[PDB]
Short mmCIF file of C-alpha atoms and ligand atoms in Angstrom, two decimals:
data_model
loop_
_atom_site.label_atom_id
_atom_site.label_comp_id
_atom_site.label_asym_id
_atom_site.label_seq_id
_atom_site.Cartn_x
_atom_site.Cartn_y
_atom_site.Cartn_z
CA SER A 2 -1.25 -7.96 -16.69
CA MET A 3 -0.26 -11.52 -17.68
CA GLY A 4 -2.88 -13.77 -16.03
CA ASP A 5 -5.25 -14.09 -13.11
CA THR A 6 -4.17 -12.33 -9.91
CA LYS A 7 -5.58 -11.84 -6.43
CA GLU A 8 -6.35 -8.23 -7.35
CA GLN A 9 -8.23 -9.21 -10.46
CA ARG A 10 -10.26 -11.74 -8.45
CA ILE A 11 -11.17 -9.06 -5.91
CA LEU A 12 -12.35 -6.77 -8.73
CA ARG A 13 -14.32 -9.58 -10.38
CA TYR A 14 -15.95 -10.35 -7.04
CA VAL A 15 -17.04 -6.72 -6.67
CA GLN A 16 -18.37 -6.63 -10.22
CA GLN A 17 -20.37 -9.82 -9.62
CA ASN A 18 -21.77 -9.00 -6.18
CA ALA A 19 -21.79 -5.27 -5.43
CA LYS A 20 -24.23 -2.61 -6.69
CA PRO A 21 -22.75 -0.01 -9.08
CA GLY A 22 -22.83 3.45 -7.52
CA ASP A 23 -23.19 2.06 -3.97
CA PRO A 24 -19.80 2.48 -2.30
CA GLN A 25 -20.93 0.59 0.80
CA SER A 26 -21.71 -2.52 -1.23
CA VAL A 27 -18.29 -2.27 -2.90
CA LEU A 28 -16.58 -2.19 0.48
CA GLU A 29 -18.69 -5.07 1.81
CA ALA A 30 -17.91 -7.16 -1.25
CA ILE A 31 -14.15 -6.61 -0.98
CA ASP A 32 -14.21 -7.29 2.77
CA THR A 33 -16.32 -10.42 2.32
CA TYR A 34 -14.03 -11.81 -0.39
CA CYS A 35 -10.88 -11.12 1.58
CA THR A 36 -12.31 -12.51 4.80
CA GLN A 37 -13.64 -15.68 3.21
CA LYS A 38 -11.16 -16.43 0.44
CA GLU A 39 -7.91 -14.41 0.07
CA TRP A 40 -6.25 -12.15 2.59
CA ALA A 41 -5.26 -8.78 1.12
CA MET A 42 -3.66 -5.55 2.28
CA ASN A 43 -6.79 -3.40 2.14
CA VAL A 44 -7.16 -1.24 5.21
CA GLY A 45 -10.28 -3.31 5.98
CA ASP A 46 -13.51 -2.72 7.85
CA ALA A 47 -12.28 -2.29 11.44
CA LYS A 48 -9.55 0.17 10.55
CA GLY A 49 -11.86 1.65 7.92
CA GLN A 50 -14.26 2.79 10.60
CA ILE A 51 -11.50 4.79 12.26
CA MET A 52 -10.77 6.21 8.83
CA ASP A 53 -14.50 7.01 8.48
CA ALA A 54 -14.49 8.89 11.78
CA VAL A 55 -11.43 10.94 10.78
CA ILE A 56 -13.00 11.95 7.45
CA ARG A 57 -16.29 12.96 9.09
CA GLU A 58 -14.52 14.96 11.80
CA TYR A 59 -12.15 17.00 9.60
CA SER A 60 -14.24 17.18 6.37
CA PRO A 61 -11.09 17.54 4.23
CA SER A 62 -11.47 19.26 0.90
CA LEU A 63 -8.38 17.68 -0.64
CA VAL A 64 -7.05 14.30 0.44
CA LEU A 65 -3.83 12.65 -0.68
CA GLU A 66 -3.57 8.85 -0.41
CA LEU A 67 -0.21 7.07 -0.67
CA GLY A 68 -0.87 3.54 -1.92
CA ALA A 69 -4.08 2.78 -3.82
CA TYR A 70 -3.77 -0.98 -4.34
CA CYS A 71 -7.28 -2.07 -5.43
CA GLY A 72 -9.04 1.13 -4.43
CA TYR A 73 -10.66 -0.03 -1.20
CA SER A 74 -9.52 2.90 0.96
CA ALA A 75 -10.02 5.34 -1.90
CA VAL A 76 -13.63 4.20 -2.18
CA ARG A 77 -13.85 4.22 1.61
CA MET A 78 -12.70 7.84 2.00
CA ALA A 79 -14.24 9.29 -1.16
CA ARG A 80 -17.76 8.13 -0.31
CA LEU A 81 -17.68 10.42 2.78
CA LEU A 82 -16.15 13.49 1.17
CA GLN A 83 -18.30 16.61 0.95
CA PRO A 84 -19.50 17.75 -2.51
CA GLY A 85 -16.58 19.35 -4.32
CA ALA A 86 -13.98 17.66 -2.14
CA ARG A 87 -11.36 15.62 -3.98
CA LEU A 88 -9.04 12.70 -3.35
CA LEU A 89 -5.67 12.17 -5.03
CA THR A 90 -4.28 8.67 -4.70
CA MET A 91 -0.73 7.74 -5.72
CA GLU A 92 0.00 4.23 -7.04
CA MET A 93 3.24 3.07 -8.66
CA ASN A 94 1.91 -0.31 -9.81
CA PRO A 95 0.17 0.20 -13.17
CA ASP A 96 -1.69 -3.06 -12.84
CA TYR A 97 -3.03 -1.93 -9.47
CA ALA A 98 -3.87 1.52 -10.85
CA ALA A 99 -5.96 -0.05 -13.60
CA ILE A 100 -7.85 -2.11 -10.99
CA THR A 101 -8.33 0.99 -8.84
CA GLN A 102 -9.85 2.92 -11.76
CA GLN A 103 -12.34 0.08 -12.32
CA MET A 104 -13.21 0.06 -8.62
CA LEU A 105 -13.77 3.84 -8.65
CA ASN A 106 -15.97 3.58 -11.74
CA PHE A 107 -17.98 0.79 -10.17
CA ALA A 108 -18.40 2.64 -6.86
CA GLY A 109 -19.36 5.80 -8.75
CA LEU A 110 -16.52 7.82 -7.24
CA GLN A 111 -14.47 8.28 -10.42
CA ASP A 112 -15.38 11.98 -10.52
CA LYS A 113 -14.08 12.58 -6.96
CA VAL A 114 -10.79 10.64 -7.10
CA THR A 115 -7.80 10.99 -9.41
CA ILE A 116 -5.16 8.29 -9.73
CA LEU A 117 -1.64 9.67 -9.97
CA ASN A 118 0.55 7.06 -11.67
CA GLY A 119 4.00 6.91 -10.13
CA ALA A 120 6.00 6.70 -6.93
CA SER A 121 5.23 9.04 -4.05
CA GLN A 122 8.89 10.08 -3.70
CA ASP A 123 8.78 11.31 -7.30
CA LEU A 124 5.25 12.77 -7.34
CA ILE A 125 5.08 14.54 -3.96
CA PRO A 126 7.74 17.18 -4.92
CA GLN A 127 5.81 17.80 -8.13
CA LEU A 128 2.33 18.22 -6.60
CA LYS A 129 2.46 22.02 -6.37
CA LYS A 130 3.64 22.76 -9.90
CA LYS A 131 2.49 19.72 -11.93
CA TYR A 132 -0.86 18.94 -10.21
CA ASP A 133 -1.79 22.48 -9.05
CA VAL A 134 -2.01 21.52 -5.37
CA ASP A 135 -1.75 24.33 -2.83
CA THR A 136 -2.00 22.46 0.47
CA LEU A 137 -3.41 19.10 1.44
CA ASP A 138 -6.10 18.77 4.09
CA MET A 139 -5.47 15.11 4.91
CA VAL A 140 -2.93 12.46 4.00
CA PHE A 141 -3.44 8.73 4.34
CA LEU A 142 -0.12 6.86 4.48
CA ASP A 143 -0.49 3.22 3.53
CA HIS A 144 2.29 2.45 1.05
CA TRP A 145 5.57 0.60 1.72
CA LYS A 146 6.39 1.13 5.38
CA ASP A 147 9.95 2.34 4.85
CA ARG A 148 8.52 5.35 2.95
CA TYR A 149 6.33 6.80 5.76
CA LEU A 150 9.07 8.87 7.36
CA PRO A 151 10.89 10.23 4.26
CA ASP A 152 7.56 11.00 2.53
CA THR A 153 6.24 12.73 5.65
CA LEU A 154 9.42 14.78 5.65
CA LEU A 155 8.87 15.41 1.94
CA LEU A 156 5.30 16.58 2.57
CA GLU A 157 6.73 19.02 5.12
CA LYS A 158 9.68 20.16 3.01
CA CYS A 159 7.49 20.79 -0.03
CA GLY A 160 5.10 23.06 1.88
CA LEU A 161 2.13 20.76 1.23
CA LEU A 162 0.93 20.73 4.86
CA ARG A 163 -0.85 23.54 6.68
CA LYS A 164 -1.88 23.98 10.29
CA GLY A 165 -4.55 21.35 10.96
CA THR A 166 -3.66 19.00 8.11
CA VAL A 167 -4.41 15.43 9.18
CA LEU A 168 -1.87 12.64 8.69
CA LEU A 169 -3.45 9.23 9.19
CA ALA A 170 -1.01 6.33 8.97
CA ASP A 171 -1.98 2.69 8.67
CA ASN A 172 0.02 -0.22 10.07
CA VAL A 173 2.00 1.68 12.70
CA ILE A 174 2.12 -1.48 14.89
CA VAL A 175 1.93 -4.29 12.29
CA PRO A 176 3.99 -4.43 10.07
CA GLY A 177 5.05 -1.43 12.19
CA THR A 178 6.46 2.03 11.47
CA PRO A 179 8.65 2.71 14.54
CA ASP A 180 10.69 5.42 12.84
CA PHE A 181 7.58 7.26 11.62
CA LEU A 182 6.03 7.00 15.09
CA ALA A 183 9.12 8.27 16.88
CA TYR A 184 9.34 11.23 14.51
CA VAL A 185 5.72 12.42 14.69
CA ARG A 186 5.30 11.62 18.38
CA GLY A 187 8.50 13.49 19.26
CA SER A 188 8.01 16.57 17.10
CA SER A 189 6.11 19.60 18.39
CA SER A 190 4.91 20.09 14.79
CA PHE A 191 2.48 17.20 15.30
CA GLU A 192 -0.29 16.39 17.76
CA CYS A 193 -0.67 12.63 17.80
CA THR A 194 -3.39 10.16 18.60
CA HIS A 195 -3.03 6.40 18.44
CA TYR A 196 -6.07 4.35 17.40
CA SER A 197 -6.14 0.74 18.62
CA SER A 198 -7.48 -1.66 16.01
CA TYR A 199 -6.81 -4.99 14.25
CA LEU A 200 -4.83 -5.99 11.18
CA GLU A 201 -7.24 -6.28 8.26
CA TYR A 202 -9.14 -9.58 8.22
CA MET A 203 -7.21 -10.87 11.27
CA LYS A 204 -7.16 -10.64 15.06
CA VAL A 205 -3.59 -9.41 15.24
CA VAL A 206 -3.63 -6.04 17.00
CA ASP A 207 -2.66 -3.10 14.80
CA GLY A 208 -3.13 0.66 15.01
CA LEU A 209 -3.41 3.89 13.13
CA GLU A 210 -1.62 7.08 14.06
CA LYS A 211 -3.41 10.36 13.55
CA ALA A 212 -0.81 13.13 13.40
CA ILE A 213 -2.18 16.66 13.00
CA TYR A 214 0.35 19.07 11.58
CA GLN A 215 0.73 22.22 13.68
CA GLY A 216 2.55 24.49 11.22
CA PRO A 217 6.30 24.98 10.72
CA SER A 218 8.66 25.55 13.67
C1 SAM B 1 -1.35 -1.67 1.34
S1 SAM B 1 -1.50 -1.22 -0.39
C2 SAM B 1 -2.63 0.18 -0.19
C3 SAM B 1 -4.01 -0.32 0.20
C4 SAM B 1 -5.08 0.77 0.17
N1 SAM B 1 -4.58 2.00 0.80
C5 SAM B 1 -6.35 0.24 0.83
O1 SAM B 1 -6.51 0.22 2.06
O2 SAM B 1 -7.28 -0.16 0.13
C6 SAM B 1 0.12 -0.45 -0.75
C7 SAM B 1 0.24 0.07 -2.18
O3 SAM B 1 1.24 1.05 -2.29
C8 SAM B 1 1.90 0.95 -3.54
N2 SAM B 1 3.18 1.61 -3.28
C9 SAM B 1 4.24 1.16 -2.53
N3 SAM B 1 5.16 2.14 -2.53
C10 SAM B 1 4.71 3.19 -3.25
C11 SAM B 1 5.23 4.44 -3.57
N4 SAM B 1 6.44 4.82 -3.14
N5 SAM B 1 4.49 5.31 -4.34
C12 SAM B 1 3.26 4.96 -4.80
N6 SAM B 1 2.75 3.72 -4.48
C13 SAM B 1 3.46 2.87 -3.70
C14 SAM B 1 1.93 -0.53 -3.82
O4 SAM B 1 1.94 -0.75 -5.21
C15 SAM B 1 0.63 -1.00 -3.18
O5 SAM B 1 -0.43 -0.99 -4.11
C1 DNI B 2 -0.61 -10.38 7.30
C2 DNI B 2 0.49 -10.31 8.44
C3 DNI B 2 0.48 -11.11 9.55
CL1 DNI B 2 -0.82 -12.26 9.73
C4 DNI B 2 1.51 -11.01 10.56
C5 DNI B 2 1.49 -11.91 11.81
N1 DNI B 2 2.46 -10.16 10.42
O1 DNI B 2 3.48 -10.05 11.42
C6 DNI B 2 2.51 -9.39 9.38
CL2 DNI B 2 3.83 -8.22 9.21
C7 DNI B 2 1.53 -9.45 8.34
C8 DNI B 2 1.65 -8.46 7.16
N2 DNI B 2 2.53 -8.43 6.14
O2 DNI B 2 2.25 -7.36 5.40
C9 DNI B 2 1.21 -6.76 5.92
C10 DNI B 2 0.61 -5.44 5.41
C11 DNI B 2 -0.55 -4.87 5.95
C12 DNI B 2 -0.96 -3.63 5.46
O3 DNI B 2 -2.16 -2.95 5.90
C13 DNI B 2 -0.19 -2.99 4.50
O4 DNI B 2 -0.67 -1.73 4.10
C14 DNI B 2 0.98 -3.57 4.01
N3 DNI B 2 1.82 -2.99 3.06
O5 DNI B 2 2.99 -3.67 2.78
O6 DNI B 2 1.51 -1.79 2.44
C15 DNI B 2 1.40 -4.79 4.49
N4 DNI B 2 0.82 -7.37 7.04
CL1 CL B 3 -11.82 -6.25 8.89
MG1 MG B 4 -2.12 -1.00 5.34
NA1 NA B 5 -19.19 16.40 -6.84
#
């Protein structure tokens, strides 16, 4: 880092307003700061509640997140994981990864979440043999939108999905992931559900796609 950034200001706002070890207060602080002061690409409170419902329904034991940013969604999912369950979050921006680690420490979720430093297209094919992953129980896609489809394909080709694995994809309407949608909605290897919501901190309509893997063809 070379100066003050939006992401550093978000982290400072958490550290000055939230309660350490209280994930809810961390999420409220980030949402308050980004509603009142600086828009940011956190998944946000409205879409977060859909995320909350998915986590509580499927109780995943191992979650992979693509795109950590400041750690909002990592904190948001990890606080609802069952004891022993784990979240891996991939982040290629080292400055963001350092912020995310500080957010996890502050929220008290550092023992449940591991930051993988690097790009998803490089790390996903290495998950089985470098990070000892068998299969993933849930995947949250929220990185650059042109990577949703090839990384989904990569998750499939690398044998990281099993029957019942949950793919939850942010931003499928805005900025929009039409190619990802057409793939998962048109493949009999996925059962899809679209969740109406709003772009974080705005009243532009957005949505999440839940795509449940059904096993190989
Ligand atoms: C929208 S932010 C994620 C926000 C986070 N999921 C939340 O709701 O709090 C997208 C992040 O993905 C990272 N990113 C983009 N492409 C990536 C890739 N191929 N592999 C790993 N990280 C990537 C960017 O650095 C950025 O931090
Ligand atoms: C803010 C905004 C508005 Cl007001 C309008 C009208 N439109 O059309 C657009 Cl496209 C945007 C917009 N740009 O980027 C994002 C965004 C949101 C994410 O949740 C996310 O994850 C990522 N990302 O790049 O990872 C990007 N949203
Ligand atoms: Cl919101
Ligand atoms: Mg997003
Ligand atoms: Na634990």
